[PDB]
Design a protein around this ligand. Structure first.
Ligand SMILES: COc1ccccc1CC(=O)N1CCC[C@H](C(N)=O)C1
Ligand SMILES: [Zn+2]
Length: 139
């Protein structure tokens, strides 16, 4: 599990979104595995505006923060989930690191703040749904 709470937005994995996220849809993208819903409260997570490629991600399945080098946002193939079929996920960033299904939502952080959230893994890899392009979260 895990979300980002910036201003009046909740950023979650689309495949872990709730009835309340959809009741309050702002933007979803199946191909990015991203959904934003509107909150009544205010949130003060800082989104990073950078092209950093090193960072720290929370790993719920080890209860640990792990430093990673990670790739540039790209299209990468993703085996048939229970949530999606076999497809190219866009805006994905891979790193060498432990992940398992429950670890989706875990935050990737860099010196300039929240980079994105765990979204994929497999074979000692871990994939991050980038959120730095989504300038509209700021304003
Ligand atoms: C944290 O991910 C894992 C790590 C190790 C093994 C399996 C998984 C699960 C996984 O990757 N997916 C299930 C949810 C939808 C995901 C997608 N973006 O389509 C694909
Ligand atoms: Zn950065």
């Amino acid at each position: 599990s895990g979300a980002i709470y910036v201003g009046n937005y909740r950023v979650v994995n689309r495949h872990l979104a709730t009835h309340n996220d959809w009741a309050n849809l702002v933007w979803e993208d199946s191909s990015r595995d991203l959904l934003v819903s509107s909150t009544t409260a205010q949130g003060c997570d800082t989104i990073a505006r950078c092209d950093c490629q090193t960072g720290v991600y929370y790993c719920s399945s080890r209860r640990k923060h792990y430093p990673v080098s990670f790739s540039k946002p790209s299209l990468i193939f993703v085996e048939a989930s229970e949530y999606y079929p076999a497809r190219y996920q866009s805006h994905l960033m891979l790193a060498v690191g432990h992940s398992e299904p429950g670890d989706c939502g875990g935050i990737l952080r860099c010196q300039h703040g929240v980079v994105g959230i765990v979204s994929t893994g497999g074979n000692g890899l871990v994939g991050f749904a980038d959120v730095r392009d989504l300038l509209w979260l700021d304003e």
